[PDB]
Amino acid sequence: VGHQPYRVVVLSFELLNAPATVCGPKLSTDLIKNQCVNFNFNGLTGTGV
Amino acid sequence: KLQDVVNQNAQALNTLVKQLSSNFGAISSVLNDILSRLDPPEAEVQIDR
Amino acid sequence: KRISNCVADYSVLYNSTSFSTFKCYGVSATKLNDLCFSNVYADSFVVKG
Amino acid sequence: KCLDFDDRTPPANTQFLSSHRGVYYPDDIFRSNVLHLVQDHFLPFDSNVTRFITFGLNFDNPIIPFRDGIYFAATEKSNVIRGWVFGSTMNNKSQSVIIMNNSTNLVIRACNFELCDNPFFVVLKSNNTQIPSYIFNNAFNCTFEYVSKDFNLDLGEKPGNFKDLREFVFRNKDGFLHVYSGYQPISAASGLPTGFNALKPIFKLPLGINITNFRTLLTAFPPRPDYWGTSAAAYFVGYLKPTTFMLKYDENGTITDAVDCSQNPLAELKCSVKSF
Amino acid sequence: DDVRQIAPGQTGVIADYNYKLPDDFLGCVLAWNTNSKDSSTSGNYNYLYRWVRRSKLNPYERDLSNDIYSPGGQSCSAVGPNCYNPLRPYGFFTTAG
Ligand SMILES: *[C@@H]1O[C@H](CO)[C@@H](O[C@@H]2O[C@H](CO)[C@@H](O[C@@H]3O[C@H](CO)[C@@H](O)[C@H](O)[C@@H]3O)[C@H](O)[C@H]2NC(C)=O)[C@H](O)[C@H]1NC(C)=O
Ligand SMILES: *[C@@H]1O[C@H](CO)[C@@H](O[C@@H]2O[C@H](CO)[C@@H](O[C@@H]3O[C@H](CO)[C@@H](O)[C@H](O)[C@@H]3O)[C@H](O)[C@H]2NC(C)=O)[C@H](O)[C@H]1NC(C)=O
Ligand SMILES: *[C@@H]1O[C@H](CO)[C@@H](O[C@@H]2O[C@H](CO)[C@@H](O[C@@H]3O[C@H](CO)[C@@H](O)[C@H](O)[C@@H]3O)[C@H](O)[C@H]2NC(C)=O)[C@H](O)[C@H]1NC(C)=O
Ligand SMILES: *[C@@H]1O[C@H](CO)[C@@H](O[C@@H]2O[C@H](CO)[C@@H](O[C@@H]3O[C@H](CO)[C@@H](O)[C@H](O)[C@@H]3O)[C@H](O)[C@H]2NC(C)=O)[C@H](O)[C@H]1NC(C)=O
Ligand SMILES: *[C@@H]1O[C@H](CO)[C@@H](O[C@@H]2O[C@H](CO)[C@@H](O[C@@H]3O[C@H](CO)[C@@H](O)[C@H](O)[C@@H]3O)[C@H](O)[C@H]2NC(C)=O)[C@H](O)[C@H]1NC(C)=O
Numbered sequence A: 001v002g003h004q005p006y007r008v009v010v011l012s013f014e015l016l017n018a019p020a021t022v023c024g025p026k027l028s029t030d031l032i033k034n035q036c037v038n039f040n041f042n043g044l045t046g047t048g049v
Numbered sequence B: 001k002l003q004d005v006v007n008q009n010a011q012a013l014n015t016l017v018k019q020l021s022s023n024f025g026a027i028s029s030v031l032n033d034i035l036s037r038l039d040p041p042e043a044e045v046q047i048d049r
Numbered sequence C: 001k002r003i004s005n006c007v008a009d010y011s012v013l014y015n016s017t018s019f020s021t022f023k024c025y026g027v028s029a030t031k032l033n034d035l036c037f038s039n040v041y042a043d044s045f046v047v048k049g
Numbered sequence D: 001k002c003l004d005f006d007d008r009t010p011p012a013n014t015q016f017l018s019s020h021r022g023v024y025y026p027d028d029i030f031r032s033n034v035l036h037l038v039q040d041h042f043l044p045f046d047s048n049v050t051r052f053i054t055f056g057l058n059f060d061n062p063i064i065p066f067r068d069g070i071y072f073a074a075t076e077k078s079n080v081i082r083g084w085v086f087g088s089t090m091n092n093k094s095q096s097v098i099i100m101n102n103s104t105n106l107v108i109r110a111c112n113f114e115l116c117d118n119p120f121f122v123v124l125k126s127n128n129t130q131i132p133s134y135i136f137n138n139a140f141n142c143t144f145e146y147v148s149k150d151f152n153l154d155l156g157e158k159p160g161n162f163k164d165l166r167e168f169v170f171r172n173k174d175g176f177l178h179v180y181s182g183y184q185p186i187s188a189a190s191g192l193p194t195g196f197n198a199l200k201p202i203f204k205l206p207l208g209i210n211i212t213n214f215r216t217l218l219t220a221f222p223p224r225p226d227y228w229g230t231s232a233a234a235y236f237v238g239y240l241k242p243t244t245f246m247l248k249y250d251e252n253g254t255i256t257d258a259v260d261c262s263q264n265p266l267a268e269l270k271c272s273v274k275s276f
Numbered sequence E: 001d002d003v004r005q006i007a008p009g010q011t012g013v014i015a016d017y018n019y020k021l022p023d024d025f026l027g028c029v030l031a032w033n034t035n036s037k038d039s040s041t042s043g044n045y046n047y048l049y050r051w052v053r054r055s056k057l058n059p060y061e062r063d064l065s066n067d068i069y070s071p072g073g074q075s076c077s078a079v080g081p082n083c084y085n086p087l088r089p090y091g092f093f094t095t096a097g
């Protein structure tokens, strides 16, 4: 097994303040305003109004 | 002298606010970033820092 | 290779691909479905075990 | 033989307040003479609680959703209510657990049960003897069984208002079903009594099943074999929500008081500076 | 190749749909090769795994159902296109890698 071939793929990610190109399969919801909610915008999560 | 007292208090409060942007050896100064990137165990390491 | 404008759903690989090695460094693997990435590169090659 | 009743009034589902009930021990750490601020799934104080009654011409056995754990309270003069079924589909397709009390001993059994539409025990009031009845038609792929020691259960009818309050908390976490219990002597005719009671841990069962629904198991009292009848009994269901409580342990490790931090400004004050 | 998925904080077919360990796990994982005992020259198809599921399992939870799976709604009475058997045999062979 030490001499057998192995295919390698290295995935390199960038997380900048820029539009998202690749995304997870998480499903979206409607906006809720003026309420204390948990939010998730392009994978950036938080709690607030 | 009265102005000096005012300035000292205002400057101390501003420094307290600015310290939040300061990293302390964690991967990020934003709590939500390490919360959204890392699973709870290593997240607890960074958050404790 | 640059990967853009897509949904990264690894579950499609579950019935065809093994992945002897799967190691993530900047992020957690349980977090991948909840994240959106600004940029993704894929480097591919072959090495022995 | 799944037997169905045809003269049952649909449940009223009247709402009552749970004054200070539903407190339990959230962990297994022994604590003595301390105040403990803990954030967990508790029943908020003075929250609405649904009532299910089988006093007369009703055998109230709906499938009630679990919704992240429940508080259950039975006003039981005649031991009518004994046992539950917890499951997801309440079918032979999925695993479900029956926690029942027959006459002799308590039985906890997890299998693929062919659950009847109306599972129930039959107790002839005249002879005060149970007739064997089938909660399930068949059972297969059983993964857990526990049977307790034998005892005696009083099957006789009891007059007057309910004298017993049996309280339970059911929580499903990490493949473990935590069952907490408590008992209180009451004299209440129609409502949930107002008080405080902390339920001690009784069971931590390693069932490992997805529990989304449950159904209470009740005994029917037919005065004649070619009919069905019910003795008076009622139970109450509330839902646990994630909230911060301040529990107060005495020297024996017993919770003797609690504060719900979100109830009102005075409670928030007591939680903010930890004191009663 | 699946043994690595038996650990806290892992994703894979086994961790998502078969056996999940808590993030705070107190214990030890022990694993040993059983080629001779559990494989055959014809092949051993007794051992199965759930390859598809609608949601991820919670820690220490097990799923014993054998319902035909459809990706979205679409109740299917038998196995066919867009209707799969959720369980998949491992197919252990003595000469496998
Ligand atoms: C899970 O529970 C259901 C509910 O009873 C079972 O379905 C029942 O299966 C029996 C046996 O196959 C059926 O009886 C058969 O009825 C047909 C007429 O349709 C007759 O030709 C056969 O000789 C036999 O009497 C019964 O109808 C059926 N009931 C329903 C409501 O579907 C099911 O079999 C159980 N699954 C397992 C694995 O035990
Ligand atoms: C309440 O439920 C329990 C558990 O289902 C019942 O216990 C069971 O009682 C029967 C009858 O006494 C036992 O059957 C006997 O088993 C022995 C083997 O130890 C055998 O030699 C006898 O010939 C007979 O088959 C059964 O083993 C026992 N189960 C357990 C787990 O102890 C109990 O009878 C029920 N009480 C009621 C319905 O009032
Ligand atoms: C959960 O319960 C089901 C139904 O009781 C179990 O499925 C049954 O598994 C047995 C084997 O343990 C099957 O019998 C075998 O059938 C094959 C093919 O005909 C035959 O070659 C074998 O000699 C043996 O007789 C049975 O057919 C099967 N029934 C169904 C409806 O699938 C299942 O194994 C249980 N899950 C467990 C125990 O984890
Ligand atoms: C923590 O638990 C211990 C042990 O149960 C409690 O100490 C015990 O207190 C009872 C009080 O009911 C004592 O029993 C009886 O007290 C009555 C009161 O007059 C007396 O008439 C009886 O003859 C009998 O003594 C019991 O002796 C005592 N046990 C000891 C001291 O070992 C303690 O009160 C509990 N802490 C609380 C409730 O805060
Ligand atoms: C425990 O069992 C319950 C019931 O079997 C599971 O709840 C079910 O979860 C699935 C998957 O999240 C839900 O399907 C979804 O339905 C929505 C529409 O409501 C659809 O947009 C999605 O694409 C997906 O098909 C299903 O509605 C839901 N059923 C109920 C009654 O809530 C639960 O996931 C199980 N828990 C575990 C840990 O397996």
Ligand SMILES: *[C@@H]1O[C@H](CO)[C@@H](O[C@@H]2O[C@H](CO)[C@@H](O)[C@H](O)[C@H]2NC(C)=O)[C@H](O)[C@H]1NC(C)=O
Binding pocket: C011, C012, C015, C016, E081, E082, E084
């Ligand atoms: C393995 O999984 C893939 C993806 O889940 C399956 O490919 C799908 O096949 C169905 C037909 O059965 C198509 O309708 C889908 O469009 C396919 N999806 C993709 C992404 O290719 C494949 O069928 C599965 N293989 C087996 C043997 O079950």
Ligand SMILES: *[C@@H]1O[C@H](CO)[C@@H](O[C@@H]2O[C@H](CO)[C@@H](O)[C@H](O)[C@H]2NC(C)=O)[C@H](O)[C@H]1NC(C)=O
Binding pocket: C016, C017
């Ligand atoms: C990798 O891609 C090749 C080429 O598409 C696949 O080989 C095909 O397999 C299907 C069966 O699903 C056959 O119907 C085709 O005739 C095959 N084509 C060729 C050119 O061989 C192969 O199955 C793929 N492997 C995986 C794991 O997806």
Ligand SMILES: *[C@@H]1O[C@H](CO)[C@@H](O[C@@H]2O[C@H](CO)[C@@H](O)[C@H](O)[C@H]2NC(C)=O)[C@H](O)[C@H]1NC(C)=O
Binding pocket: D015, D046, D047, D048
């Ligand atoms: C408890 O449940 C009742 C429902 O019976 C809630 O609604 C009240 O209903 C009565 C009549 O049924 C009205 O007179 C009240 O005005 C209703 N209150 C409302 C709408 O706020 C009641 O609100 C619930 N209380 C709590 C604390 O949950």
Ligand SMILES: *[C@@H]1O[C@H](CO)[C@@H](O)[C@H](O)[C@H]1NC(C)=O
Binding pocket: D124, D126, D127, D129
């Ligand atoms: C007494 O109990 C037995 C036990 O089954 C029952 O058959 C009988 O009917 C009961 N007595 C009367 C009067 O019903």
